[PDB]
Design an enzyme around this catalytic site. Sequence first.
Site, PDB file in Angstrom:
ATOM      1  N   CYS A 254       0.838  -1.186   0.000  1.00  0.00           N
ATOM      2  CA  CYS A 254       0.000   0.000   0.000  1.00  0.00           C
ATOM      3  C   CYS A 254       0.879   1.243   0.000  1.00  0.00           C
ATOM      4  O   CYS A 254       1.592   1.501   0.967  1.00  0.00           O
ATOM      5  CB  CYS A 254      -0.908  -0.046   1.224  1.00  0.00           C
ATOM      6  SG  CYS A 254      -1.839   1.455   1.492  1.00  0.00           S
TER       7      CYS A 254
ATOM      8  N   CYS B 112       0.190   3.792   2.787  1.00  0.00           N
ATOM      9  CA  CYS B 112       0.736   3.260   4.037  1.00  0.00           C
ATOM     10  C   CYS B 112       2.217   3.565   4.156  1.00  0.00           C
ATOM     11  O   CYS B 112       2.690   3.973   5.220  1.00  0.00           O
ATOM     12  CB  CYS B 112       0.527   1.744   4.103  1.00  0.00           C
ATOM     13  SG  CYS B 112      -1.181   1.226   4.400  1.00  0.00           S
TER      14      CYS B 112
END
Length: 143
Positions: A69, A72
């Site tokens: 991600c 993230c």
Amino acid sequence: GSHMMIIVCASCDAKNRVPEEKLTAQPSCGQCHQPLLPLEPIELNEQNFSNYITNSDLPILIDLWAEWCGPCKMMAPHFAQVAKQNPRVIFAKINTEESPRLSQAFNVRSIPTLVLMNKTTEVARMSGALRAPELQQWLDQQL
Ligand SMILES: [Zn+2]
Ligand SMILES: [Zn+2]
């Protein structure tokens, strides 16, 4: 009494009784000697989560994330920096792919999702990457 606070060890599950005045000294677990308050994100997973959240006295800010991600990865250094700034808040990470039942239980949609827990109750949550100043401000507003 010594204003004992229950600080859980995520490595061996021990519920450490830590005097409130000792928290600033960042003591180690009385059983396994791992750091109890590293002022860094700790790893929670399906094998330590329930014990950790149920018995902890300090608020816990959880970052639900995955390795693939991008947002993230953008958030990760800011989450680690803010962890250094809040010695009485546990910063924790749950990998949604490693811990899919926990991700589902938190009703995660996009990641990163941050969930603030206190004494087993969800206080607040947010999603999306944030820079450190904005993250600190959000945390302060909730606590
Ligand atoms: Zn006290
Ligand atoms: Zn331990």
